[PDB]
Amino acid sequence: VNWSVEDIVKGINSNNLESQLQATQAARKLLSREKQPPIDNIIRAGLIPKFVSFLGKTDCSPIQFESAWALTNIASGTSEQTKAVVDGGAIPAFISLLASPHAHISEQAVWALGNIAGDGSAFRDLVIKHGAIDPLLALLAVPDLSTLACGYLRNLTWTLSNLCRNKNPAPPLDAVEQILPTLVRLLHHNDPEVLADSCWAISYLTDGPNERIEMVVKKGVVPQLVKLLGATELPIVTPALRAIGNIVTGTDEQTQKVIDAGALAVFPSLLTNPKTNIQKEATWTMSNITAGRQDQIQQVVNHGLVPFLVGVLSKADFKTQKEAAWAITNYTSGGTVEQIVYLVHCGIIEPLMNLLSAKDTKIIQVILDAISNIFQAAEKLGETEKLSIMIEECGGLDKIEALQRHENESVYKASLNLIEKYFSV
């Protein structure tokens, strides 16, 4: 074994079918060895078109299988290499094999199409234009998904998820509406990996305009996304939290469906998750919720989440702290006077003042905005003096005075307004 590319070329070109099979096996072994498949050597030998033609040889199903595997591995490389597979006519040929009576050939064609679509929007739309969605969904048309082999079902879920992926442009609306019902079924399956890729698909489809968010929401997936948010497997929580985060960027009505499904009961553990990426994502999601209606801010209060946002603002890494500050600003600009009082009783002032030491200019503006909003609520109550002594007792007044020297302009004018308005006489 360890054939040379020249040996492979020789065997593939013969009129002997048995030597074509052996040569394709050698090519597949050469292309499936862990490190450095010599993909470019294979492309330059001109083998792609011949492999694509073998994909049609329904008689010799072994050479169909070996070709599909070789081409899967070529299509799994760079965009330039995936492009050679596409220019070789491979997409229609793989689509044809989706109907093969041999399950393992059909699976390998699903996998190859996943790699092609995974290259980007352009190749994803090619795959859809050649009509891949119908035969793919027909493979999942069985009433009980547990009858499919676990590996088969996983690859179908992964390839479907790649047809939902990427933007500029987003997938065509026709295709999304065709895929969503099957995606809903997969989201209720039990296999961890199926659930993870289904969540990734939903997170792709909800990454876009509110119109796309409504397509997914109207299918009823939010309660199951929330249940998967409470899972213990991090590869499920990550995409589920990504999807929930996208949905609460939409309207107050779409955000409310996330709250109605109970999402706020899971967020205390997300905001204290040991993985920094989860905390940051969950805090960002909280800032868009606190940007909603006053009654939705109130459900944040009632689920006891304010003390956890204060915790994040106090103890988290700086990038997550930025997100928490945004959630406070949004809270203080949209909240009632009684909600702001409660925010103050939770100890917001000090951790907020402490972040005014941050070099980052954007966050300083966010913080000053929150301070002004709280002062406006304090004016309604006639308690601006009480709030002003509180800011002095946290070390805050010195930091606000120091801001005058700041280079930025909006910071300069903002801090001077606060000092003249509440720290005079």
Partner: peptide, 11 residues
Amino acid sequence: TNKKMRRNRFK
């Protein structure tokens, strides 16, 4: 609006 969709661009 008050909601931010572009956390990624915000970076």
